[PDB]
Ligand binder design. Structure first.
Ligand SMILES: [Zn+2]
Ligand SMILES: [Zn+2]
Lengths: 133, 133
């Protein structure tokens, strides 16, 4: 459908507005490369390797392909209200970019433990209400 | 690079602005389905099957994948000044959508002859200077 097409392409335009924002240009979890997936659980943009590790959490985070998913209006709007800068202030609100503890990202076991500390144990976490203000 | 990323994502945002315009939602040549390629020779949005036939013209038209090409700023701006509505007024300026001669698009030989009439012999053509005014 053309009406279907119209909304689909609008969502992709909105998506590419977001993928060009500076914090969204690098994976939220490793900061080492460009994102290929969105992590819908928290509203971040992540790379494939980190997406694989996020699926190893329990419960696992929900990742969807940037290029292949047909995102809904609800999902696009959630992402607009989140993204990597908003997420940084929450999940990494206490993290110091110079020296806070990061894994060797070539190691899946260490990346798992790190993602657990980040999201489950909330080692560097500032609650969203505070983070926003 | 992040600066590289920024321009790349900007171009994709600009591209998706165009792919959502009503005339761009259908292949410029067959009007039968959604476009997957841009025809850079004329500035249109076309489907895969028509792209295959466009490559059979001599000289052939230059088609590039919507999803896989890294378009340049120059290319994006050309497309912004063209697209399927602008192209309709030129290449189909004399064509009647109710009854002008179209091929069975399931037939490659007939599609070739049609594209020759459209682009080479200019059967339905209005020059761009007139078409614009
Ligand atoms: Zn990553
Ligand atoms: Zn076509």
């Amino acid at each position: 459908s053309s009406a279907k097409r119209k909304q689909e392409e609008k969502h992709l335009k909105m998506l590419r507005d977001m993928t060009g924002l500076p914090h969204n240009r690098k994976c939220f979890d490793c900061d080492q490369r460009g994102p290929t997936y969105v992590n819908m659980t928290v509203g971040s943009f992540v790379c494939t390797s980190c997406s694989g590790s996020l699926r190893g959490l329990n419960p696992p985070h929900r990742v969807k392909s940037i290029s292949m998913t047909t995102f809904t209006q609800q999902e696009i709007e959630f992402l607009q209200k989140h993204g990597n800068e908003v997420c940084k202030q929450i999940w990494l609100g206490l993290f110091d970019d110079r020296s806070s503890a990061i894994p060797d990202f070539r190691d899946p076991q260490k990346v798992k433990e790190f993602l657990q500390e980040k999201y489950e144990k909330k080692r560097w976490y500032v609650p969203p209400e505070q983070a926003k203000v």
